[PDB]
Structures are given as structure tokens and as C-alpha cells.
Amino acid sequence: GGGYGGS
């Protein structure tokens, strides 16, 4: 799986 975060 995988993902991200940011802003």
C-alpha cells in the first residue's frame, strides 16, 4: 500500500 501527506 502507500500514501502521502502534505500541505
Author numbering: 234 to 240
Describing publication, verbatim:
Extensive studies have identified that many RNA-binding proteins, such as FUS, hnRNPA1, and TDP43, largely contribute to this conditional cellular compartmentation. These proteins commonly contain low complexity (LC) domains that can drive the full-length proteins to undergo liquid–liquid phase separation (LLPS) via weak multivalent interactions. In this work, we directly visualize temperature-sensitive amyloid fibrils in the liquid-like droplets of hnRNPA1 by transmission electron microscopy (TEM). Our work bridges the liquid phase and solid phase of hnRNPA1 and illuminates the functional role of reversible amyloids in the assembly of stress granules and the pathological risk as intermediates en route to irreversible fibrils.
As a control, we also determined the atomic structure of segment 234GGGYGGS240 by X-ray diffraction. This segment does not form fibrils or hydrogels and thus may not be an amyloid core. Indeed, the structure showed an unfolded conformation with no fibrillar packing.
